[PDB]
Nucleic acid binder design. Structure first.
Length: 242
DNA sequence: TTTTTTC
């Protein structure tokens, strides 16, 4: 792992990650916008469906999640599969692997249909069971990138809908992808998957909350709105990993 | 433009 990184991430803490999530994270902003233009249950269903097709994008993540939010705001959505069948081929930022992606939506449509208000609250109180349930519906490994971040974005949606905050489970790990490998190789020769899981365990900050911290800081987003005590912590983290 | 997944 990294004692240097884990100590500063521990100082930032779940509440520092939460500040970034609710103030800087553009995915959270797009979700908060969408939640104002569609009913709560459809909102959460769409966010999970979107997460499951958000890979190998023809654009950057922030652009795509705003495109998704702007597309469904005020839209009358019945079948989520049918909605995506029309949305994806006309989108700007998600035009690759549409046949594969539509088939994943079709296969998870029955699980999404169980997401009443009460079911969404139950899963938000036990995101590990939601993690396993989504993977089982798809027939994939729950540690796969899309399933892990379907849980993260569900957590964004659920905290908006329910006006409560439950931290992500510690046992949901960041999987390896292109940008986590590119960054981690500069920091260490350790295996990226093991590196970041040990950092989460040592710091006390679940991996999905660490993810919220890393990318805005690396991408150069302003941290000036953070309170000075948290700002100085994020500043030191930047000097360590950027 | 190059920004995970398959059955």
């Amino acid at each position: 792992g990294s004692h240097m990184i884990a100590r500063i991430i521990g100082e930032i803490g779940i509440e520092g990650a939460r500040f970034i999530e609710e103030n800087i994270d553009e995915q959270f902003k797009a979700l908060r916008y969408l939640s104002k233009g569609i009913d709560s249950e459809t909102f959460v269903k769409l966010v999970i469906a979107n997460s499951l097709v958000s890979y190998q994008l023809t654009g950057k993540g922030e652009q795509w999640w705003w495109e998704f939010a702007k597309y469904f705001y005020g839209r009358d959505v019945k079948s989520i599969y049918l909605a995506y069948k029309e949305f994806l081929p006309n989108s700007r930022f998600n035009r690759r692997l549409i046949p594969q992606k539509l088939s994943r939506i079709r296969r998870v449509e029955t699980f999404l249909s169980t997401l009443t208000e009460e079911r969404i609250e139950e899963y938000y109180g036990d995101m590990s069971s939601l993690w396993g349930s989504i993977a089982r519906a798809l027939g994939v490994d729950k540690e796969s990138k899309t399933v892990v971040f379907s849980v993260k974005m569900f957590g964004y949606a659920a905290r908006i809908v329910l006006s409560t905050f439950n931290p992500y489970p510690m046992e949901i790990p960041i999987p390896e992808d292109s940008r986590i490998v590119k960054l981690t190789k500069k920091l260490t020769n350790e295996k990226p998957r093991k590196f970041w899981m040990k950092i989460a365990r040592e710091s006390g900050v679940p991996p999905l909350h660490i993810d919220s911290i890393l990318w805005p800081l690396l991408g150069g987003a302003s941290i000036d709105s953070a309170p000075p005590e948290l700002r100085d912590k994020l500043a030191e983290l930047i000097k360590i990993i950027r």
